Amino acid sequence: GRIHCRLVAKKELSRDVRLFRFSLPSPDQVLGLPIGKHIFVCATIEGKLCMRAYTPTSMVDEIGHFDLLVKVYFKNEHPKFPNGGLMTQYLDSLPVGSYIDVKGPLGHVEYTGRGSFVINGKQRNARRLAMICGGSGITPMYQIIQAVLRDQPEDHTEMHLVYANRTEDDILLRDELDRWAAEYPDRLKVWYVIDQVKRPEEGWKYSVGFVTEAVLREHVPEGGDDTLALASGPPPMIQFAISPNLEKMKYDMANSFVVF
Numbered sequence: 506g507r508i509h510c511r512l513v514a515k516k517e518l519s520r521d522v523r524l525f526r527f528s529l530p531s532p533d534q535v536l537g538l539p540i541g542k543h544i545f546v547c548a549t550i551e552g553k554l555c556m557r558a559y560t561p562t563s564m565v566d567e568i569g570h571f572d573l574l575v576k577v578y579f580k581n582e583h584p585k586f587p588n589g590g591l592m593t594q595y596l597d598s599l600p601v602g603s604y605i606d607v608k609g610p611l612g613h614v615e616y617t618g619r620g621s622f623v624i625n626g627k628q629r630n631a632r633r634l635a636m637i638c639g640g641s642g643i644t645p646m647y648q649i650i651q652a653v654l655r656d657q658p659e660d661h662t663e664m665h666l667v668y669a670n671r672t673e674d675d676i677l678l679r680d681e682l683d684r685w686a687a688e689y690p691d692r693l694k695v696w697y698v699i700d701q702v703k704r705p706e707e708g709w710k711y712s713v714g715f716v717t718e719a720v721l722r723e724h725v726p727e728g729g730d731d732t733l734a735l736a737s738g739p740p741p742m743i744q745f746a747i748s749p750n751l752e753k754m755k756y757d758m759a760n761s762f763v764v765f
Protein backbone atom coordinates (compact mmCIF):
# COMPACT_ATOMS: atom_id res chain seq x y z
CA GLY A 506 0.00 0.00 0.00
CA ARG A 507 1.33 3.42 -0.76
CA ILE A 508 2.46 6.01 1.74
CA HIS A 509 3.99 9.44 1.43
CA CYS A 510 7.20 9.26 3.39
CA ARG A 511 10.04 11.73 2.54
CA LEU A 512 13.80 12.20 2.59
CA VAL A 513 13.88 13.44 6.13
CA ALA A 514 17.66 12.96 5.95
CA LYS A 515 20.86 11.44 4.50
CA LYS A 516 24.00 9.94 6.17
CA GLU A 517 26.44 8.44 3.63
CA LEU A 518 28.13 5.94 5.97
CA SER A 519 31.22 5.75 3.78
CA ARG A 520 32.60 5.92 0.25
CA ASP A 521 29.47 4.74 -1.54
CA VAL A 522 27.41 3.63 1.49
CA ARG A 523 24.24 5.53 2.26
CA LEU A 524 22.15 5.84 5.35
CA PHE A 525 18.66 7.13 4.40
CA ARG A 526 16.20 8.74 6.86
CA PHE A 527 12.81 8.43 5.14
CA SER A 528 10.37 9.43 7.92
CA LEU A 529 6.66 8.47 8.11
CA PRO A 530 3.67 10.64 7.07
CA SER A 531 2.07 10.46 10.52
CA PRO A 532 4.73 10.32 13.28
CA ASP A 533 2.74 8.40 15.89
CA GLN A 534 2.53 5.15 13.92
CA VAL A 535 5.19 2.73 12.62
CA LEU A 536 6.09 1.34 9.17
CA GLY A 537 4.66 -1.86 10.62
CA LEU A 538 6.19 -4.42 8.17
CA PRO A 539 6.17 -8.05 9.48
CA ILE A 540 9.57 -9.55 10.11
CA GLY A 541 10.05 -11.52 6.92
CA LYS A 542 9.09 -8.76 4.49
CA HIS A 543 10.25 -5.62 2.59
CA ILE A 544 9.10 -2.38 0.91
CA PHE A 545 9.05 -1.89 -2.91
CA VAL A 546 10.29 1.73 -3.05
CA CYS A 547 8.54 3.43 -5.86
CA ALA A 548 10.42 6.17 -7.64
CA THR A 549 8.92 6.72 -11.09
CA ILE A 550 11.97 6.75 -13.38
CA GLU A 551 12.69 7.05 -17.02
CA GLY A 552 9.62 5.34 -18.45
CA LYS A 553 9.31 2.85 -15.56
CA LEU A 554 8.53 3.16 -11.85
CA CYS A 555 11.67 1.16 -10.82
CA MET A 556 9.89 -0.78 -8.09
CA ARG A 557 12.85 -2.19 -6.24
CA ALA A 558 12.37 -4.36 -3.23
CA TYR A 559 14.14 -3.09 -0.03
CA THR A 560 14.03 -4.04 3.67
CA PRO A 561 14.89 -1.12 6.00
CA THR A 562 17.00 -2.30 8.95
CA SER A 563 16.20 -0.11 12.05
CA MET A 564 14.07 -0.83 15.13
CA VAL A 565 10.32 -1.81 14.95
CA ASP A 566 9.74 0.21 18.07
CA GLU A 567 11.06 3.31 16.24
CA ILE A 568 8.02 5.50 15.63
CA GLY A 569 7.43 7.50 12.46
CA HIS A 570 10.67 6.73 10.54
CA PHE A 571 12.24 3.63 8.88
CA ASP A 572 15.96 3.38 8.09
CA LEU A 573 17.57 2.24 4.89
CA LEU A 574 21.38 1.78 4.54
CA VAL A 575 22.24 1.65 0.89
CA LYS A 576 25.23 0.60 -1.17
CA VAL A 577 24.97 3.06 -4.10
CA TYR A 578 25.68 1.66 -7.60
CA PHE A 579 27.69 4.55 -9.10
CA LYS A 580 28.93 5.48 -12.61
CA ASN A 581 32.25 4.90 -14.60
CA GLU A 582 33.43 2.30 -12.06
CA HIS A 583 32.38 -1.14 -13.39
CA PRO A 584 32.80 -3.38 -16.54
CA LYS A 585 29.85 -5.23 -18.08
CA PHE A 586 27.94 -1.91 -17.59
CA PRO A 587 30.39 0.86 -16.41
CA ASN A 588 27.33 3.00 -15.51
CA GLY A 589 25.81 1.64 -12.25
CA GLY A 590 22.04 2.09 -12.04
CA LEU A 591 19.12 4.47 -12.44
CA MET A 592 17.38 3.87 -9.07
CA THR A 593 20.05 3.67 -6.37
CA GLN A 594 21.93 6.66 -7.84
CA TYR A 595 18.52 8.33 -8.16
CA LEU A 596 17.99 7.56 -4.45
CA ASP A 597 21.35 9.17 -3.78
CA SER A 598 20.94 12.29 -6.06
CA LEU A 599 17.51 12.53 -4.51
CA PRO A 600 17.90 15.37 -1.97
CA VAL A 601 16.24 15.57 1.41
CA GLY A 602 12.79 17.00 1.84
CA SER A 603 11.65 15.15 -1.26
CA TYR A 604 8.73 12.78 -0.49
CA ILE A 605 9.32 9.13 -1.46
CA ASP A 606 6.67 6.37 -1.97
CA VAL A 607 7.00 3.24 0.21
CA LYS A 608 4.97 -0.04 0.07
CA GLY A 609 5.05 -2.68 2.85
CA PRO A 610 4.58 -5.72 3.21
CA LEU A 611 5.23 -7.77 0.06
CA GLY A 612 6.79 -11.02 1.14
CA HIS A 613 6.89 -14.73 1.93
CA VAL A 614 9.19 -15.18 4.87
CA GLU A 615 7.82 -14.14 8.33
CA TYR A 616 8.85 -14.97 11.92
CA THR A 617 5.86 -15.83 14.19
CA GLY A 618 6.45 -16.10 17.90
CA ARG A 619 9.51 -17.61 19.54
CA GLY A 620 11.50 -19.69 17.12
CA SER A 621 8.99 -20.73 14.46
CA PHE A 622 8.51 -19.49 10.91
CA VAL A 623 5.42 -19.05 8.75
CA ILE A 624 6.29 -19.59 5.09
CA ASN A 625 4.76 -19.40 1.58
CA GLY A 626 1.62 -21.14 2.74
CA LYS A 627 2.95 -23.46 5.38
CA GLN A 628 5.16 -22.38 8.26
CA ARG A 629 8.17 -24.15 9.72
CA ASN A 630 9.40 -24.12 13.32
CA ALA A 631 13.18 -23.97 13.69
CA ARG A 632 15.55 -24.05 16.63
CA ARG A 633 18.99 -23.43 14.92
CA LEU A 634 19.29 -21.42 11.68
CA ALA A 635 21.76 -20.93 8.74
CA MET A 636 22.28 -17.38 7.57
CA ILE A 637 24.68 -17.38 4.54
CA CYS A 638 24.02 -13.83 3.39
CA GLY A 639 25.87 -12.05 0.59
CA GLY A 640 26.58 -8.39 -0.23
CA SER A 641 23.90 -5.99 1.08
CA GLY A 642 21.73 -9.05 1.63
CA ILE A 643 22.50 -8.68 5.33
CA THR A 644 19.50 -6.38 6.04
CA PRO A 645 16.63 -8.77 5.15
CA MET A 646 18.33 -11.19 7.54
CA TYR A 647 19.04 -8.51 10.17
CA GLN A 648 15.25 -8.22 10.12
CA ILE A 649 15.12 -11.68 11.64
CA ILE A 650 18.26 -11.58 13.85
CA GLN A 651 17.72 -8.38 15.93
CA ALA A 652 14.13 -9.41 16.51
CA VAL A 653 15.23 -12.90 17.64
CA LEU A 654 17.60 -11.39 20.28
CA ARG A 655 15.06 -8.72 21.36
CA ASP A 656 12.44 -11.46 22.06
CA GLN A 657 15.34 -12.82 24.20
CA PRO A 658 15.98 -14.16 26.74
CA GLU A 659 13.25 -16.68 25.81
CA ASP A 660 13.60 -17.12 22.04
CA HIS A 661 17.15 -18.28 22.59
CA THR A 662 17.62 -19.63 19.06
CA GLU A 663 20.87 -20.41 17.31
CA MET A 664 22.10 -18.56 14.24
CA HIS A 665 25.30 -19.40 12.31
CA LEU A 666 25.40 -16.44 9.95
CA VAL A 667 28.14 -16.30 7.27
CA TYR A 668 28.40 -12.71 6.25
CA ALA A 669 29.50 -13.33 2.65
CA ASN A 670 30.88 -10.13 1.28
CA ARG A 671 33.51 -9.15 -1.28
CA THR A 672 36.17 -7.13 0.58
CA GLU A 673 37.40 -6.29 4.07
CA ASP A 674 36.16 -2.68 3.98
CA ASP A 675 32.87 -3.85 2.50
CA ILE A 676 31.54 -5.47 5.69
CA LEU A 677 28.53 -3.12 5.99
CA LEU A 678 26.97 -3.98 9.35
CA ARG A 679 30.14 -5.19 11.00
CA ASP A 680 29.67 -4.12 14.62
CA GLU A 681 25.86 -4.33 14.78
CA LEU A 682 26.85 -7.99 14.54
CA ASP A 683 30.45 -7.94 15.94
CA ARG A 684 29.27 -6.19 19.13
CA TRP A 685 26.06 -8.23 19.36
CA ALA A 686 27.17 -11.91 18.87
CA ALA A 687 29.79 -11.58 21.57
CA GLU A 688 27.57 -10.57 24.45
CA TYR A 689 25.17 -13.13 22.97
CA PRO A 690 26.98 -16.43 22.24
CA ASP A 691 24.86 -19.60 22.04
CA ARG A 692 22.37 -17.27 20.39
CA LEU A 693 24.23 -16.05 17.27
CA LYS A 694 27.33 -17.22 15.47
CA VAL A 695 28.98 -14.61 13.27
CA TRP A 696 31.40 -15.32 10.44
CA TYR A 697 33.03 -13.03 7.91
CA VAL A 698 34.51 -14.19 4.53
CA ILE A 699 36.45 -11.98 2.05
CA ASP A 700 38.12 -12.24 -1.38
CA GLN A 701 40.44 -9.25 -1.12
CA VAL A 702 42.05 -8.53 2.27
CA LYS A 703 43.07 -4.85 2.07
CA ARG A 704 44.94 -4.69 5.30
CA PRO A 705 46.74 -7.97 6.26
CA GLU A 706 48.26 -5.67 8.88
CA GLU A 707 44.95 -5.21 10.64
CA GLY A 708 45.23 -8.96 11.11
CA TRP A 709 42.61 -11.14 9.45
CA LYS A 710 41.43 -14.32 11.16
CA TYR A 711 38.09 -14.91 9.41
CA SER A 712 37.64 -16.43 5.95
CA VAL A 713 39.65 -15.20 2.90
CA GLY A 714 37.94 -15.77 -0.47
CA PHE A 715 34.35 -16.90 -1.21
CA VAL A 716 31.89 -19.58 -0.08
CA THR A 717 33.17 -23.11 -0.36
CA GLU A 718 32.23 -26.46 1.34
CA ALA A 719 35.03 -25.97 3.90
CA VAL A 720 33.54 -22.63 4.88
CA LEU A 721 30.09 -24.17 4.71
CA ARG A 722 31.26 -27.06 6.98
CA GLU A 723 32.51 -25.25 10.10
CA HIS A 724 30.20 -22.20 10.42
CA VAL A 725 26.95 -24.00 9.47
CA PRO A 726 24.88 -26.69 11.29
CA GLU A 727 23.36 -29.99 9.99
CA GLY A 728 20.10 -29.74 8.00
CA GLY A 729 18.47 -33.16 7.83
CA ASP A 730 15.00 -32.55 9.27
CA ASP A 731 14.59 -29.42 11.47
CA THR A 732 16.99 -26.66 10.22
CA LEU A 733 16.12 -23.72 7.88
CA ALA A 734 18.45 -21.63 5.70
CA LEU A 735 17.86 -17.89 5.06
CA ALA A 736 20.24 -16.99 2.19
CA SER A 737 20.58 -13.63 0.40
CA GLY A 738 22.88 -12.73 -2.56
CA PRO A 739 23.93 -12.34 -6.30
CA PRO A 740 22.33 -15.27 -8.12
CA PRO A 741 25.63 -16.94 -9.16
CA MET A 742 26.65 -16.69 -5.54
CA ILE A 743 23.73 -19.06 -5.14
CA GLN A 744 23.76 -21.35 -8.22
CA PHE A 745 27.30 -22.59 -7.56
CA ALA A 746 28.14 -21.96 -3.90
CA ILE A 747 25.16 -22.03 -1.61
CA SER A 748 22.91 -24.44 -3.46
CA PRO A 749 25.39 -27.18 -4.58
CA ASN A 750 27.66 -27.62 -1.51
CA LEU A 751 24.61 -27.19 0.73
CA GLU A 752 22.79 -29.61 -1.55
CA LYS A 753 25.55 -31.98 -0.67
CA MET A 754 25.73 -30.91 3.04
CA LYS A 755 22.69 -33.14 3.86
CA TYR A 756 20.30 -30.21 3.98
CA ASP A 757 16.97 -29.56 2.26
CA MET A 758 17.10 -27.25 -0.78
CA ALA A 759 13.60 -27.35 -2.30
CA ASN A 760 11.54 -27.51 0.87
CA SER A 761 13.33 -24.66 2.71
CA PHE A 762 16.15 -22.84 0.89
CA VAL A 763 14.94 -19.28 1.21
CA VAL A 764 16.29 -16.13 -0.48
CA PHE A 765 15.50 -12.37 -0.38
Ligand SMILES: Cc1cc2nc3c(=O)[nH]c(=O)nc-3n(C[C@H](O)[C@H](O)[C@H](O)COP(=O)(O)OP(=O)(O)OC[C@H]3O[C@@H](n4cnc5c(N)ncnc54)[C@H](O)[C@@H]3O)c2cc1C
Pocket residue numbers: 543555557558559560573574575576577578579582583586588589590591592593594641644645765
Ligand atom coordinates in the same frame (compact mmCIF):
# COMPACT_ATOMS: atom_id res chain seq x y z
C1 LIG B 1 14.26 -7.49 -0.57
C2 LIG B 1 15.49 -6.87 -0.88
C3 LIG B 1 16.05 -6.04 -0.03
C4 LIG B 1 17.12 -5.37 -0.44
N1 LIG B 1 17.68 -4.55 0.50
C5 LIG B 1 18.68 -3.63 0.10
C6 LIG B 1 19.51 -2.80 1.05
O1 LIG B 1 19.52 -2.68 2.26
N2 LIG B 1 20.46 -1.98 0.49
C7 LIG B 1 20.73 -1.77 -0.79
O2 LIG B 1 21.56 -0.96 -1.09
N3 LIG B 1 19.94 -2.58 -1.62
C8 LIG B 1 18.95 -3.56 -1.29
N4 LIG B 1 18.34 -4.50 -2.23
C9 LIG B 1 17.72 -3.85 -3.27
C10 LIG B 1 17.85 -4.23 -4.78
O3 LIG B 1 18.66 -5.35 -5.21
C11 LIG B 1 18.23 -3.16 -5.64
O4 LIG B 1 18.10 -3.43 -7.07
C12 LIG B 1 19.54 -2.64 -5.15
O5 LIG B 1 19.35 -1.63 -4.10
C13 LIG B 1 20.19 -2.02 -6.49
O6 LIG B 1 19.31 -1.03 -7.11
P1 LIG B 1 19.58 -0.08 -8.45
O7 LIG B 1 18.47 0.82 -8.90
O8 LIG B 1 20.92 0.45 -8.57
O9 LIG B 1 19.36 -1.57 -9.11
P2 LIG B 1 19.30 -1.93 -10.69
O10 LIG B 1 18.84 -0.68 -11.42
O11 LIG B 1 18.57 -3.26 -10.70
O12 LIG B 1 20.93 -2.21 -11.11
C14 LIG B 1 21.86 -2.81 -10.15
C15 LIG B 1 22.33 -4.13 -10.79
O13 LIG B 1 23.44 -4.14 -11.75
C16 LIG B 1 24.69 -4.45 -11.06
N5 LIG B 1 25.68 -3.33 -10.80
C17 LIG B 1 25.64 -2.10 -11.29
N6 LIG B 1 26.71 -1.38 -10.93
C18 LIG B 1 27.39 -2.18 -10.15
C19 LIG B 1 28.56 -1.84 -9.48
N7 LIG B 1 29.05 -0.63 -9.26
N8 LIG B 1 29.09 -2.81 -8.76
C20 LIG B 1 28.48 -4.00 -8.65
N9 LIG B 1 27.33 -4.30 -9.26
C21 LIG B 1 26.78 -3.39 -10.06
C22 LIG B 1 24.24 -5.08 -9.75
O14 LIG B 1 24.85 -6.38 -9.66
C23 LIG B 1 22.69 -4.98 -9.58
O15 LIG B 1 21.83 -6.15 -9.40
C24 LIG B 1 17.56 -5.49 -1.75
C25 LIG B 1 17.00 -6.38 -2.53
C26 LIG B 1 15.97 -7.07 -2.10
C27 LIG B 1 15.46 -8.22 -2.87
